[PDB]
Amino acid sequence: DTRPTIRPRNDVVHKQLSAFGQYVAEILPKYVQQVQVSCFNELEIFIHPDGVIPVLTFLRDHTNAQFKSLADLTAVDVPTRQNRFEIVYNLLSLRFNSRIRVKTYTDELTPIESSVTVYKAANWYEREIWDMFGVFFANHPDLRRILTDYGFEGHPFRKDFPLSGYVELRYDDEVKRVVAEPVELAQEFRKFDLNSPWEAFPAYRQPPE
Amino acid sequence: LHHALIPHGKGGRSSVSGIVATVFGATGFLGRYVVNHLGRMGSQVIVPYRCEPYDTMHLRPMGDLGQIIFMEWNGKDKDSIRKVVEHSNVVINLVGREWETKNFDFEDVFVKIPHAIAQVSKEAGVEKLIHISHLNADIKSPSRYLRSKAVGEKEVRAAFPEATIIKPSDIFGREDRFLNYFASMRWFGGVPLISLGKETVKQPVYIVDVSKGIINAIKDPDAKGKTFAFVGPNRYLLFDLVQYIFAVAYRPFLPYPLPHFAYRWVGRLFEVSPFEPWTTRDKVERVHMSDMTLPHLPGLEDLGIQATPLELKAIEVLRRHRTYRWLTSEMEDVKPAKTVNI
Amino acid sequence: ILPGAAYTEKSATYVNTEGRAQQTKVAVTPPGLAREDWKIIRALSEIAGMTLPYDTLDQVRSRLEEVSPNLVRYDDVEGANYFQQANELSKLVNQQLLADPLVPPQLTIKDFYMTDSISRASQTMAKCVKAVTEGIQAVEEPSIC
Amino acid sequence: GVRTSPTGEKVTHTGQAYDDGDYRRVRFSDRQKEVNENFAIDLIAEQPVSEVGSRVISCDGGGGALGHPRVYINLDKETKTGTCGYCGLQFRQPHH
Amino acid sequence: FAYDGLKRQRLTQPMIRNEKGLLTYTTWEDALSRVAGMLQSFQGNDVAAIAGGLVDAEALVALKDLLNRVDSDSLCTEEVFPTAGAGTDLRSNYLLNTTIAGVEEADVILLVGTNPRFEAPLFNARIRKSWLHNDLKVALIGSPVD
Amino acid sequence: KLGLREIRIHLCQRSPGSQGVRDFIEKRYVELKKANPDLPILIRECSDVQPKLWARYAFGQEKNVSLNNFSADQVTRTLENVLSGKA
Amino acid sequence: TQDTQLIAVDEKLDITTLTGVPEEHIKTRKVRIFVPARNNMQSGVNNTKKWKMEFDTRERWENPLMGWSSTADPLSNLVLTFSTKEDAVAFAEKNGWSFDVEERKVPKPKSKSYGANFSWNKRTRVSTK
Amino acid sequence: GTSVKPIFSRDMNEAKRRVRELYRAWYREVPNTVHLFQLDISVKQGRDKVREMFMKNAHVTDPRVVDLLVIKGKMELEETINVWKQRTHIMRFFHETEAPRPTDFLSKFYVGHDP
Ligand SMILES: NC(=O)C1=CN([C@@H]2O[C@H](COP(=O)(O)OP(=O)(O)OC[C@H]3O[C@@H](n4cnc5c(N)ncnc54)[C@H](OP(=O)(O)O)[C@@H]3O)[C@@H](O)[C@H]2O)C=CC1
Ligand SMILES: [Zn+2]
Closest alpha carbon to H5 in G2, A81, A32: G2
Contact F52, F4 (CB under 8 A): no
CA max distance for chain D: 57
CB contact under 8 Å between H97 and A150, yes or no, is no
Q: Which helix (DSSP H) or strand (DSSP E) does residue F29 occupy?
A: helix F29-35
Which residue of B10, B12, B66 is in closest CB contact with G64?
A: B66
DSSP string of B321-340, one letter each residue: SS-GGGTT--TTSSPPPP-B
| Chain centroid, CA C77 distance in Å | 18
CA distance, residue E3 to nearest chain B CA (Å): 21
CA distance D22 to B4: 7
Please calculate the CA angle E35-E36-E41 and round it to the nearest 5 degrees.
100
Residues in contact with ligand 1 (CB, 6 Å cut-off): B 25-31, 50-51, 75, 94-97, 104, 109, 132, 134, 168, 170-171, 178
DSSP string of H35-96, one letter each residue: HHTT-SS-HHHHHHHHHHHHHHTTT---HHHHHHHHHHHHHHHHHHHTT-S-HHHHTTSS--
Q: Which helix (DSSP H) or strand (DSSP E) does residue B238 occupy?
A: helix B238-249
What's the sign of the alpha-carbon dihedral F51, F56, F60, F63?
Answer: negative
- Measured in degrees and rounded to the nearest 5, phi and psi for residue B172 equal -115, 145
Contact C13, C23 (CB under 8 A): yes
CA distance, residue A176 to nearest chain B CA (Å): 10
Is position D84 annotated in a ligand binding site? Answer: yes
CB contact under 8 Å between C33 and E14, yes or no, is yes
Question: Which chains have 3 or more CB–CB distances shorter than 8 Å to chain H?
Answer: A, B, C, E, G
Q: Is G70 on the interface with C (CB under 8 A)?
A: no
**CA C84 → CA B72, C91, D66, F9, distances in Å?**
85, 11, 79, 18
CA distance B207 to B172: 6
CA of A175 to the centre of ligand 1 (A): 21
CA distance D16 to B309: 52
Which amino acid residue places its CA nearest to atom 17 of ligand 1? Answer: B97
State the resolution, in angstroms. 2.1
CA of D58 to the centre of ligand 2 (A): 8
Chain D residues close to B44, C-beta within 8 Å: 23, 26
D88: left (phi over 0), alpha (psi -120 to 50) or beta: left
Number of neighbours of residue C135 by Cβ within 10 angstroms: 9
**CA C80 → CA F10, F14, G26, H11, distances in Å?**
12, 12, 39, 54
Q: Which helix (DSSP H) or strand (DSSP E) does residue E99 occupy?
A: none
CA of B72 to the centre of ligand 2 (A): 50
CA distance C39 to C13: 14
Please calculate the CA angle B10-B15-B20 and round it to the nearest 5 degrees.
125
Q: Which helix (DSSP H) or strand (DSSP E) does residue C57 occupy?
A: helix C57-67
- DSSP bridge partners of E4: none
Which amino acid residue places its CA nearest to atom 47 of ligand 1? Answer: B134
Collapsing DSSP to helix, strand or coil, A54 comes out as helix
Q: Residues 6 or more apart from B259 whose CB is under 8 A from it?
A: B194
Helical pair C57-67 and E57-69, crossing angle rounded to 10 deg: 70
Domain ranges (residues) in chain F? 2-87
After which residues are there C–N gaps above 2.5 Å in chain D? none
Which amino acid residue places its CA nearest to atom 41 of ligand 1? Answer: B25
Q: Is B61 on the interface with A (CB under 8 A)?
A: yes
Contact C42, C54 (CB under 8 A): yes
Closest alpha carbon to B253 in B202, B310, B191, B296: B191
CA distance D18 to D5: 8
Closest alpha carbon to A107 in A135, A131, A71: A135
Q: Which helix (DSSP H) or strand (DSSP E) does residue A121 occupy?
A: none
Which amino acid residue places its CA nearest to atom 42 of ligand 1? Answer: B96
Which ligand is located closest to the Cα atom of residue D72? 2
Torsion angle (degrees, nearest 10) of CA B30, B36, B39, B41: -100
Contact B289, B217 (CB under 8 A): no
CA distance E89 to E92: 9
G75: left (phi over 0), alpha (psi -120 to 50) or beta: alpha
Q: Is D20 on the interface with B (CB under 8 A)?
A: no
Pair type for strands A85-93 and A98-106? antiparallel
Closest alpha carbon to B83 in B24, B19, B18, B165: B24
Q: What is the CA radius of gyration of chain H?
A: 18
After which residues are there C–N gaps above 2.5 Å in chain E? none
Locate the chain E residue with the closest alpha carbon to B3: E12
End-to-end CA distance of chain G: 67
The sheet that has G51-55: what strands, in order across it? G79-82, G51-55, G30-34, G98-101
Torsion angle (degrees, nearest 10) of CA B14, B19, B20, B26: -90
**CA B195 → CA A90, B140, B200, B237, E106, distances in Å?**
83, 22, 9, 12, 107
CA distance A56 to A114: 11
Closest alpha carbon to E117 in E144, E99, E98: E144
Is position D59 annotated in a ligand binding site? Answer: yes
CA distance B289 to B201: 8
Q: Which helix (DSSP H) or strand (DSSP E) does residue F54 occupy?
A: strand F52-57
The strand ranges marked E within chain A are 32-37, 43-47, 69-77, 85-93, 98-106, 112-113, 137-138, 167-172, 177-182
Collapsing DSSP to helix, strand or coil, B293 comes out as coil
Q: Residues 6 or more apart from D86 whose CB is under 8 A from it?
A: C145, D59, D61, D67, D68, D69, D71
Helical pair C57-67 and C37-47, crossing angle rounded to 10 deg: 90
Closest alpha carbon to B111 in B56, B75, B141, B151: B151
Collapsing DSSP to helix, strand or coil, B180 comes out as helix
Collapsing DSSP to helix, strand or coil, G79 comes out as strand
Annotated binding site of B for NADPH: 25, 27, 29-31, 50-51, 94-98, 145, 149, 170-171, 176-177
CB contact under 8 Å between C26 and G32, yes or no, is no
Which amino acid residue places its CA nearest to atom 24 of ligand 1? Answer: B95
Structure determination technique employed: cryo-EM
Burial classification of residue D33, based on how many CB atoms lie within 10 Å of its CB (0-12 exposed, 13-18 middle, 19 or more buried) = middle
CA distance E146 to C107: 8
CB-based contacts of C116-121 (< 8 A; 24+ apart in sequence):
C116/E53, C116/E54, C117/E5, C117/E9, C117/E52, C117/E54, C118/C6, C118/E2, C118/E3, C118/E5, C118/E6, C118/E54, C119/E2, C119/E5, C120/E5, C121/E4, C121/E5, C121/E6, C121/E8, C121/E9
Contact G115, G125 (CB under 8 A): no
CA distance, residue C62 to nearest chain G CA (Å): 14
Please calculate the CA angle A31-A37-A39 and round it to the nearest 5 degrees.
160
CA distance G36 to G21: 26
- DSSP bridge partners of F86: none
Is position D96 annotated in a ligand binding site? Answer: no
CA of D70 to the centre of ligand 2 (A): 7
Pocket test for ligand 1, best of B27, B30, B55 (most atoms within 8 A of CB): B30
Chain G residues close to B42, C-beta within 8 Å: 64
Which residue of A154, A191, A197 is in closest CB contact with G39?
A: A197
Which ligand is located closest to the Cα atom of residue B172? 1
CA of A178 to the centre of ligand 2 (A): 55
Collapsing DSSP to helix, strand or coil, A167 comes out as strand
| Chain centroid, CA A135 distance in Å | 11
Collapsing DSSP to helix, strand or coil, B34 comes out as helix
Please calculate the CA angle G115-G120-G125 and round it to the nearest 5 degrees.
55
What's the sign of the alpha-carbon dihedral H46, H52, H57, H61?
Answer: positive
CA distance G45 to G39: 9
Q: How many residues does chain G have?
A: 129
**CA G38 → CA A201, D36, G46, G49, G106, distances in Å?**
19, 43, 9, 10, 10
- Measured in degrees and rounded to the nearest 5, phi and psi for residue B232 equal -80, 180
CB-based contacts of C55-63 (< 8 A; 24+ apart in sequence):
C55/H105, C56/H115, C57/C11, C57/E58, C57/H115, C58/G98, C60/E58, C60/E61, C60/E62, C61/C13, C61/E58, C63/E61, C63/E65
CA of B300 to the centre of ligand 1 (A): 21
CA distance A166 to A161: 9
Which ligand is located closest to the Cα atom of residue D62? 2
Question: Which chains have 3 or more CB–CB distances shorter than 8 Å to chain D?
Answer: B, C
CA distance B241 to B182: 9
CB contact under 8 Å between B40 and H97, yes or no, is yes
- Measured in degrees and rounded to the nearest 5, phi and psi for residue F62 equal -120, 150
